[PDB]
């Protein structure tokens, strides 16, 4: 089956979120499109996109290195698209800005811009954990900028409990 997601909890009529590891996520439903959260030379050394590419057995990286020197570097808020590998058919690499590292907020908006060029995602929630912004701020971009259909897998039920009463206020 296509885009077989389960178990998540409708919040818009185009977002949806699970308390998950966007890793075992992408495994079972093998979405058409896998968001990573990237950074400008797609180094995945860790967090989000270090599981994703330690999960492709590091194909990831391989061909991240080969796109970077054809094409040089992301900017903070842009994308690209590469393979999805055994985790999804296309992978959406978007950079999110890293406000522990003094990029703009405002960023973010741009960020969550690129998931509206394809249908259906499976996605992280944008900037949080340690690149340092707050993640009800993240889920509110989220839901006022994405209009085509997006399944959030946050892998934290602390976290996760507190977005969703955030939204339910
Ligand atoms: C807010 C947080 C709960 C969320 N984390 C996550 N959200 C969704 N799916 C996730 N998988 C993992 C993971 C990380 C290591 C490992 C694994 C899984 C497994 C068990 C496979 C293993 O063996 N190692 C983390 C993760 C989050 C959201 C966004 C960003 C971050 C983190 S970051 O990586 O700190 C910086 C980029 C932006």
Same mark, same amino acid.
């Given at each position: 089956?296509? =885009?077989?997601?389960?178990?998540? +909890?409708?919040?818009?009529?185009?977002?949806?979120?699970?308390?998950?590891?966007? &890793?075992?996520?992408?495994?079972?439903?093998?979405?058409?499109?896998?968001? =990573?959260?990237?950074?400008?030379?797609?180094?995945?050394?860790?967090?989000?996109?270090?599981?994703?590419?330690?999960?492709?057995?590091?194909?990831?990286?391989?061909?991240?290195?080969?796109?970077?020197?054809? =094409?040089?570097?992301?900017?903070?808020?842009?994308?690209? &698209?590469?393979?999805?590998?055994?985790?999804?058919?296309?992978? +959406?690499?978007?950079?999110?800005?890293?406000?522990?590292?003094? @990029?703009?907020?405002?960023? #973010?908006?741009?960020?969550? @811009?690129?998931?509206?060029?394809? @249908?259906?995602?499976?996605?992280? #929630?944008?900037?949080?954990?340690?690149?340092?912004?707050?993640?009800?701020?993240? +889920?509110?971009?989220?839901?006022?900028?994405?209009?085509?259909?997006?399944?959030?897998?946050?892998?934290?039920?602390?976290?996760?409990?507190?977005?969703?009463?955030?939204? +339910? @206020?």
């Amino acid at each position: 089956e296509v =885009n077989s997601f389960s178990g998540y +909890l409708k919040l818009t009529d185009n977002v949806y979120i699970k308390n998950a590891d966007i &890793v075992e996520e992408a495994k079972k439903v093998k979405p058409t499109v896998v968001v =990573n959260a990237a950074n400008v030379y797609l180094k995945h050394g860790g967090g989000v996109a270090g599981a994703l590419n330690k999960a492709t057995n590091n194909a990831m990286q391989v061909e991240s290195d080969d796109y970077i020197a054809t =094409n040089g570097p992301l900017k903070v808020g842009g994308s690209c &698209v590469l393979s999805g590998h055994n985790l999804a058919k296309h992978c +959406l690499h978007v950079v999110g800005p890293n406000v522990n590292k003094g @990029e703009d907020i405002q960023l #973010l908006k741009s960020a969550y @811009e690129n998931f509206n060029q394809h @249908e259906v995602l499976l996605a992280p #929630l944008l900037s949080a954990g340690i690149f340092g912004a707050d993640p009800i701020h993240s +889920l509110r971009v989220c839901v006022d900028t994405v209009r085509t259909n997006v399944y959030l897998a946050v892998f934290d039920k602390n976290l996760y409990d507190k977005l969703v009463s955030s939204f +339910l @206020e």
